[PDB]
């Protein structure tokens, strides 16, 4: 039975690959050839948010585009006021090994997690004045790699174990669980409509899930190595990825295949983060080499470089407003570029 | 007014500095090892579905945070990136075992990791007493797993522990060499391995960890000050 079933799987895989071949009448470079290149993009560090003691392992902008939470391996979440660099909060984490942090879209909550396998929810607006652990979402059997709020009550998380899960914060239960990967799920990105989210894993495959139904809809496998970063194109029909193989890929949900790949053979460092600009014309990416490259999303070439960090760039985020970019690093500084 | 916000920011900065003082004075240690090894009892020996277990212990008035990784997936390629820039890695292996080849592969992967290339390993060859009675038993012929042991002799620079058989010393130092030759192959002076033979109950395990951390910090400052 096993051989026959695996051959049936191979047959369906061949059908999918042939469909992708048929849909590949042209490449993005052919379509975009007529368009005007962005030129030399140059950005300067407008703010340098210092105060973290250890590697800044994650960051996330608030929807207000001014406040940004930032997780450090020393066990601190600092909510920064980027406009003035004031520290609005300094939340002492229970587990020092925090690998991710999220900012609720309403700004009421922040989440964080890591090697503790527990996603702690923090309430920023309690009557008591301080910041307290609203919930401790436990149930993962591996380190928490990423987490993103759908709303103040629903949070979707990825784990070092094979699974990715959706939680209800009121009860602390898993509303649904996602399976289908084989390696560690390394990143999440939430679609603007919040009905879909895409996750990359150590198996070098990116999978599109539906939160409402709890199943994988389609899979993408254009990477030779594991995927460390993932981000949705603002339109919500395409998403970029970053891998240890040091090249980004752009995938389209409706075309069900890769559209473009960004690489420069002298770049051999893996990619740690990815993010589109508000228009989607720029595709910023962080690298194990201590700088970020601003790729032009439509014409795959390095439009600029953000070289201002003394160590690995670990996180990167463009404000929902799009005014500025923020990058964290293992040197324990966040620098806002614009 | 925003001036009150700036005052709050400065108070938070003061608290962050007070936390930094504690952070720098403490030495972080990552405890790794195969399940058959006694790391789980070594942590419990400290006399001071969750993941990181944090053990706090102090020797000669310097603090130590030993992290046992607990529940994770089998392969550690990714999450061990976090444990960069720890003071040292305490890799614990069961010498009485054959799991020895698996432990050697596991130490090869840890040692040659691209991120742990500046982290010295305080290698613990745990369960030396079980190894002793396993060698004296004779039935467990280590040679059939390691044919090289048929043609190995204890080196001139080795010193036997008081009251030990020649065969047990030969076997234990052979295992020591089997780890040391992995350590020497790829470490270009950036990180060092410190083998030890231990039983989990030894009160000297913490003392050995303290002395090795002393040497590791000495080397770190020596390289920082351009003396090497």
């Amino acid at each position, epitope marked *: 039975e096993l051989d026959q079933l695996r051959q049936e799987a191979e047959q369906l895989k061949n059908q999918i690959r042939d469909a992708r071949k048929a849909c590949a009448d042209a490449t993005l470079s052919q379509i975009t050839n007529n368009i005007d290149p962005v030129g030399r993009i140059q950005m300067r560090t407008r703010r340098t948010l210092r105060g973290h003691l250890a590697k800044i392992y994650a960051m996330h902008w608030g929807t207000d585009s001014r406040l940004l939470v930032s997780a450090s391996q020393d066990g601190k979440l600092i909510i920064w006021d980027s406009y003035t660099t004031n520290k609005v909060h300094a939340i002492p984490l229970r587990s020092s090994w925090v690998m991710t942090c999220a900012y609720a879209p309403s700004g009421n909550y922040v989440a964080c997690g890591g090697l503790d396998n527990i996603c702690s929810i923090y309430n920023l607006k309690t009557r008591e*004045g*301080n910041v307290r652990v609203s919930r401790e979402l436990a149930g993962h059997t591996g380190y928490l790699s990423c987490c993103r709020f759908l709303d103040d009550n629903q949070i979707v998380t990825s784990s070092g174990d094979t699974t990715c899960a959706l939680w209800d914060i009121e009860t602390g239960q898993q509303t649904t669980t996602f399976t289908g990967h084989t390696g560690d799920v390394m990143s999440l990105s939430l679609a603007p409509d919040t009905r879909l989210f895409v996750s990359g894993a150590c198996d070098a495959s990116a999978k599109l899930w539906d939160v409402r139904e709890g199943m994988c809809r389609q899979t993408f496998t254009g990477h030779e190595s594991d995927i460390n970063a993932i981000c949705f194109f603002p339109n919500g029909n395409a998403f970029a990825t970053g891998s240890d193989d040091a090249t980004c890929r752009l995938f389209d949900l409706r075309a069900d295949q890769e559209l473009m790949t960004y690489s420069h053979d002298n770049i051999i460092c893996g990619i740690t983060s990815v993010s589109f600009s508000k228009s989607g014309r720029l595709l910023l990416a962080g690298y194990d080499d201590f700088n970020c490259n601003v790729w032009d999303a439509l014409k795959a070439d390095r439009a600029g470089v953000l070289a201002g960090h003394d160590n690995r760039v670990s996180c990167l985020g463009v404000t929902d407003d799009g005014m500025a970019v923020a990058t964290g690093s293992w040197d324990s500084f966040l620098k806002i570029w614009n | 007014e*925003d001036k009150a916000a700036v005052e709050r920011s400065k*108070m938070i900065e003061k608290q962050l500095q007070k936390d930094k003082q504690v952070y720098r004075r403490t030495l972080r240690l990552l405890l790794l090892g195969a399940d058959n090894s006694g790391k789980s009892t070594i942590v419990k020996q400290m006399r001071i579905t969750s993941g990181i277990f944090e053990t706090k212990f102090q020797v000669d008035k310097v603090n130590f945070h030993m992290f046992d990784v607990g529940a994770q997936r089998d392969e550690r390629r990714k999450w061990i990136q976090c444990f960069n820039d720890v003071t040292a890695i305490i890799f614990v292996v069961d010498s009485s075992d054959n799991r020895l080849q698996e432990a050697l592969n596991d130490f090869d992967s840890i040692w040659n990791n691209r991120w742990l290339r500046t982290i010295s390993v305080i290698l613990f060859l745990n369960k030396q007493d079980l190894l002793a009675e396993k060698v004296l038993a004779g039935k467990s012929k280590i040679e059939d797993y390691f044919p090289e042991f048929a043609r190995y002799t204890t080196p001139e620079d080795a010193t036997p522990e008081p009251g030990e058989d020649p065969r047990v010393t030969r076997a234990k130092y052979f295992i020591r060499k089997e780890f040391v030759d992995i350590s020497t192959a790829s470490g270009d002076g950036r990180h060092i391995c410190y083998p030890h033979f231990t039983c989990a109950v030894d009160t000297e395990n913490a003392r050995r960890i303290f002395n090795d951390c002393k040497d590791i910090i000495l080397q770190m400052n020596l390289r920082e000050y351009n003396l090497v």
Partner: single-chain antibody
Amino acid sequence: VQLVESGGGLVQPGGSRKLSCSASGFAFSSFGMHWVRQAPEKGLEWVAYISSGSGTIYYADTVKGRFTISRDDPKNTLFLQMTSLRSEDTAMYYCVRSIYYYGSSPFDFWGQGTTLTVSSDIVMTQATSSVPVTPGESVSISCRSSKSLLHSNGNTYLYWFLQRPGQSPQLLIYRMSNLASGVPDRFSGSGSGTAFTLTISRLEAEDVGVYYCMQHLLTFGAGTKLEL
């Protein structure tokens, strides 16, 4: 969340007293503390302020040096020592909570208050001291400022309080547009930066009271009564 004051009573101008308040149910250390006096048949007056961590202190001109404000975070107690009293000091004294950061709501909570019996600033003017009204109909409370409150940073520092008879003031709107926690949607705020408005669309039976405008570039308005 409770702020209970201690002291008060009879004083002759040749005497002295210490006002005290105890904080319960919240992190007193993080909050800056204000003292606000409710003089008999009069509006509110700001007395003194001490920031979080005691790093900043301010006093009213009438009281600058005449009284001294103190604070003990470990015991969650706020003190206001009154060295030389005079007739102007007779009033009910409220300890007022406040915290300052982006998006915070200063003056969110007011203490129960204690009464003391005794033998340039931005002048705030409210449209009228009283307005007959009935529940269910909309009404607008209006006030004007000595100068524009629209600070360069891009927000207007105006606060609207409702002192229900027999109760401490409640914060309705802070920074001219933001409803405070627990405030029903009935209320709303608007302003041009130098003239300001507070609208209650569907006045409830519980909305009876005096409405106080305040600026925080501290001065309160004369208070507008809604005679139900």
